[PDB]
Amino acid sequence: AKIEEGKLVIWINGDKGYNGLAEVGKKFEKDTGIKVTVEHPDKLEEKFPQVAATGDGPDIIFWAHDRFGGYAQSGLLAEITPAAAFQDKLYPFTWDAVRYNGKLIAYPIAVEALSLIYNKDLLPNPPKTWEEIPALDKELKAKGKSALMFNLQEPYFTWPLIAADGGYAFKYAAGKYDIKDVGVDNAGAKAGLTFLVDLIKNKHMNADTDYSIAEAAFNKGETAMTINGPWAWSNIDTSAVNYGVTVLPTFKGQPSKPFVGVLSAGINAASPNKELAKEFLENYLLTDEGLEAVNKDKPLGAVALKSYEEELAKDPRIAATMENAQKGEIMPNIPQMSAFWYAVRTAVINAASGRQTVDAALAAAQTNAAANTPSPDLTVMSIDKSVLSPGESATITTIVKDIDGNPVNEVHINKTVARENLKGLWDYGPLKKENVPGKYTQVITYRGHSNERIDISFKYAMSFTKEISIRGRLS
Amino acid sequence: AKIEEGKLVIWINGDKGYNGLAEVGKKFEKDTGIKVTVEHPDKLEEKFPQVAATGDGPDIIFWAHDRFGGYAQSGLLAEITPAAAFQDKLYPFTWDAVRYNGKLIAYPIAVEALSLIYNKDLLPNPPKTWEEIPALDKELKAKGKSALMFNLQEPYFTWPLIAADGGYAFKYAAGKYDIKDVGVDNAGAKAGLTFLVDLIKNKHMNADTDYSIAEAAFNKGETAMTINGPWAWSNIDTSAVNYGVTVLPTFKGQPSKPFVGVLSAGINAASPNKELAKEFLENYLLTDEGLEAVNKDKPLGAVALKSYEEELAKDPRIAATMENAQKGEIMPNIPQMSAFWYAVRTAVINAASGRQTVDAALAAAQTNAAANTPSPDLTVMSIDKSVLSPGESATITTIVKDIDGNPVNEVHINKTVARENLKGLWDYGPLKKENVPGKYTQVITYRGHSNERIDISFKYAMSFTKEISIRGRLS
Ligand SMILES: OC[C@H]1O[C@H](O[C@H]2[C@H](O)[C@@H](O)[C@@H](O[C@H]3[C@H](O)[C@@H](O)[C@@H](O[C@H]4[C@H](O)[C@@H](O)[C@@H](O)O[C@@H]4CO)O[C@@H]3CO)O[C@@H]2CO)[C@H](O)[C@@H](O)[C@@H]1O
Ligand SMILES: OC[C@H]1O[C@H](O[C@H]2[C@H](O)[C@@H](O)[C@@H](O[C@H]3[C@H](O)[C@@H](O)[C@@H](O[C@H]4[C@H](O)[C@@H](O)[C@@H](O)O[C@@H]4CO)O[C@@H]3CO)O[C@@H]2CO)[C@H](O)[C@@H](O)[C@@H]1O
């Protein structure tokens, strides 16, 4: 778990070839004596910024490149400066993905795009268009099958459809992304989303479909199609299914336009093992043998390493991946990407479920994606009472504001309570959103039993913290 | 995510039928208007006690019953008092598993035991004994296969072997478990472990084998045998494999003796939805239809509900589960179970890898399993400096002690740093174990850039917290 001199800790997502990566680690250990521990914590991409600067992260973090600009802006990443000879071993466009403010911030590993994955026995002539899928589903349902299942809970999987007829994240102009010019609520985006929503209302898909439901349904031969990336191919191979990987369907005659990720490896700026990390990545992983070991576990996609990619490129599944990639767009790496994703995630889910209209959902995503970040300097937190007797209550009031002093309407707040002794009895109300932007309250009732101090910390937007204390006394 | 009046949040492990459970939730929602959100956080069993009492848990927690005594001791669980008619619908021994200090603390759902799962094409006559497996592996390796792969990283999977020839957790006598009488280092336990270790050294298994490696190897037809529970059967069915589920091999002519878990559902004492939770569990889940929906996703094992179990019991896989269960032991539910597991986990891993001898590994597990818990009242935490100028360092010293004032040698300490502004530059050393029991130090160097206050909290044994603060000032 712990970062220490002389050992390497690596975090990679649980859908990737972590076992194969650990094999590369074993080889490094054999040669160097340096143990390499590969972990796949949930929410690693959220945890990393919280722990990296405060002494508790991995030495190396793997994620798609979209997360890395935010990390770099915060100073969390070592600058990557490989020799020209090494740089020349990887595709130039992959280095571009991991460049932030003129500096290389990670090593590129592999290029990922979603494709249409289809069952050749059920559906050897997969549809050209999205909009026929409902009629197709009707046909399949009459023989115990469904047309299509994919993960509706992650916006990555729905974006290609939202983008097909013109939806965009941030407008690109004059050498940069305009962080206030968000394209999620344009005509093209509302449509794509509407379409999905109609698929649902018409009982072709289920709003609750997640990664595991879709994977199981495809791999068991129950659904004719899924939308997934190269990492998914291994489990399909394990199954009995004869599958193809192809171009995503069109929408309004336009290609679906997936957001393309470059799986990337960053080095923690606070690591005492930066040089070892670089050696591991450059000399062990980013080799034919190293990438093969990871790929054999879960396929990587179109790898960044030219020598190995030249071999993979022959695979029709890879050719299809690259085709879909070329029809989409390489994700920005800017800090605002997470805000964009969080916003779109909420809009797809809310709409799919009919908890809001498409017009409304997407209008709101636009606001939230473009929102300023909370400022520690202007955010307020107080409690009305710092000592409680049994039966007394204290209320926390917090008001979250940006750098300009303007409220931030939607904010992630993580509450943590530190307890002196675990002997006192306490009741916590919900964190209540009040009827003005940025304002939340929480009621805490001391019920006695034992004297106990508690310290309540609110972490805002997975960044800064404010804290209050309560002394519970029996008298 | 959040606990709120009028909605249900459920936590269940990611290896269980969470999608099927969500289906039961949908039915409840249809009837009642109460949304049911099923989550599968990693480490849910560790998180639950940390958040349940402090206003941030689920309404309902699912885990095997072994975890629940600790939760109950801490006051985290609502007492369960179903009508006699309802009680009579479930097997008596399952209620016994969820009784703590004379009170029912959860609803029993299903009985789980590990079995030997084997590939009928590769190995239709699976071995009787463990000790022949190495020779068998030799035969299989000569035809591109291995004999056996199972999760070595979780002690649950190795326990049946450790226990076969007499290993035990806590001695049971006079109506109770003796928490100071730990059986992990007896002759029978050292042997079983030694055997596994020899399997490894002789290249029959790999010390690094985890759940996913083993699952993939079995399901792809690469390994003849695995050790797993009923939840695993779904993915095997998806694969091409013809498999059987049978009695675990013997060791020294003794049955392997798995620790048997009762998957159980507890209600958070702090839930404002206790009655809804009870209705969901009693009236929706613990019905033929409800359990079927979960079972169809991932098999539950031998369910607690007699009416449904009578149907399942016909399944030879269930018969085998029950056979292995009867050869093992129902886990204690006492608070000390987690300490036991943590200890055995470290001993298996350390030994399997050859980082310690079996004799040593198991001697140490014994000490740690029997150890007193840290006391908030006697644990020390201080920092030598509470204000720093740039280039100055402060050192935290903590000394962890039990209720009696005795040091606790091994302690889990989770460090969290709350940051005022994220503008200061700080360097954190490792948390250093000093050369006497219970004592740890950490060096923090302020590097300037900006004035910033940080608050550093140490949480001990996932229980109490102590905190210090540092004001970093440029002057
Ligand atoms: O509370 C909501 C959820 O929040 C967390 O998920 C967030 C991430 O933190 C964001 O970074 C973002 O995720 C993007 C991701 O950055 C992007 O690369 C892409 O992810 C693909 C990935 O490239 C691919 O290799 C493979 O792993 O599939 C991923 C998709 O699942 O797309 C993501 C958006 O879908 O936004 C999400 C929220 O949507 C947290 O992890 C969740 O547990 C939490 O529910
Ligand atoms: O830091 C080490 C690891 O710590 C955490 O794992 C702990 C758990 O918190 C403990 O409760 C215990 O786990 C037992 C578990 O309580 C017991 O029921 C059994 O679990 C079976 C389960 O019954 C079955 O249904 C299925 O899910 O498989 C489980 C086994 O994986 O056995 C467990 C012990 O193997 O001890 C473990 C540590 O071993 C934390 O979750 C980990 O992430 C962490 O690495």
UniProtKB/Swiss-Prot annotation, chains A, B:
Transmembrane segments: none annotated. Pfam families: SBP_bac_1. It is found in: Periplasm. Keywords: Periplasm, Signal, Sugar transport, Transport. PROSITE patterns: SBP_BACTERIAL_1. GO terms for molecular function: carbohydrate transmembrane transporter activity; maltose binding. It comes from the Bacteria. One of its GO terms (biological process) is DNA damage response. Disulfide bonds: none annotated. The keyword Signal applies. Induction: Induced by maltose and the transcriptional regulator MalT. Permanently repressed by cold shock in a PNPase-dependent fashion. One of its GO terms (cellular component) is ATP-binding cassette (ABC) transporter complex, substrate-binding subunit-containing. Belongs to the bacterial solute-binding protein 1 family. The complex is composed of two ATP-binding proteins (MalK), two transmembrane proteins (MalG and MalF) and a solute-binding protein (MalE). Part of the ABC transporter complex MalEFGK involved in maltose/maltodextrin import. Binds maltose and higher maltodextrins such as maltotriose. This is Maltose/maltodextrin-binding periplasmic protein. The lineage of its organism: Bacteria, Pseudomonadati, Pseudomonadota, Gammaproteobacteria, Enterobacterales.
